[PDB]
């Protein structure tokens, strides 16, 4: 299906503590494959996914120098923004960027990204047409006018449709087998007491991958999406994910409810019910 290559970059100023902390993370289909962290005696891009060690020492040297170059630009950018927003040199600020492309199953570009944020708020972004810019505030307008004059949008469109896509194709074919990895969830229902004549049924989905999943509770075949609680999907820490959804039901009516688990790893959705140990 549709795939993507994106870099999530962060620069955080640390006045009075040292140089800004600079981090660049590369993703292929929401999976981290490379990372550069300036917090090292000799920082360099490092592989984060096995299939990347297939690249030669020339690739890493080049990427590393490019990241060191961006670290410098961001260092300057942090100073520039202190001016644009009339802020002191004693506070910590953050600059973030999401740069990348998404392609279709035919390998062609579906959309490119290049968006900035200052202290957690949108700053400037390249529009879908890949020619114009959307500034978030007055400070961003100064940047917009510079980039419009220098033809920055044109430079990015060339990178997005060319370099970005070409390398994504290369990556996708090197990690395809790994990227298509699938781990089905194992589910079960737990029973918990509630004040008075009610009880809670909690449906667990454990050890699945990727994180995308849907859990539902039905009462006699109808989906119950109102008074149903659920937690955000969370990492188990071993590469797989967890999630649960619960509903409060009348004591003695547990058999009227069924849990449904939908995940791309399953041959078909899982259907479960509370099972009192015989």
């Amino acid at each position: 299906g549709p795939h993507s290559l994106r870099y999530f970059v962060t620069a955080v100023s640390r006045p009075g503590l040292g140089e800004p902390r600079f981090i660049s993370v590369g993703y292929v289909d929401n999976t981290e494959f490379v990372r550069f962290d300036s917090d090292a005696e000799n920082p360099r891009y490092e592989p984060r996914a096995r299939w990347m060690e297939q690249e030669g020492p020339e690739y890493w040297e080049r990427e590393t120098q490019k990241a060191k170059g961006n670290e410098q630009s961001f260092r300057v950018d942090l100073r520039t923004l202190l001016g644009y927003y009339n802020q002191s040199k004693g506070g910590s600020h953050t600059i973030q960027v999401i740069s990348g492309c998404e392609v279709g199953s035919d390998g062609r570009l579906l959309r490119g990204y290049q968006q900035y944020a200052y202290d957690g708020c949108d700053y400037i972004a390249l529009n879908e047409d890949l020619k114009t810019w959307t500034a978030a505030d007055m400070a961003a307008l100064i940047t917009k006018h510079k980039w419009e004059q220098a033809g920055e949008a044109e430079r990015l469109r060339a990178y997005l449709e060319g370099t970005c896509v070409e390398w994504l194709r290369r990556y996708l074919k090197n990690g395809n087998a790994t990227l298509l990895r699938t781990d089905s969830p194992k589910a079960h229902v737990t029973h918990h007491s509630r004040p008075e004549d009610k009880v809670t049924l909690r449906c667990w989905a454990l050890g699945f991958y990727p994180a995308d999943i849907t859990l539902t509770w039905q009462l006699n075949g109808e989906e119950l999406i109102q008074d149903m609680e659920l937690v955000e999907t969370r990492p188990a820490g071993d590469g797989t994910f967890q999630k649960w959804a619960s509903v409060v039901v009348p004591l003695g009516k547990e058999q009227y409810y069924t849990c449904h688990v939908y995940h791309q790893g399953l041959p078909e959705p899982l259907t479960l019910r509370w099972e009192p140990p015989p």
Partner: peptide, 8 residues
């Protein structure tokens, strides 16, 4: 591969 960012 990443792109070299322009300055703000």
């Amino acid at each position: 591969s990443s792109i070299e960012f322009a300055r703000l």
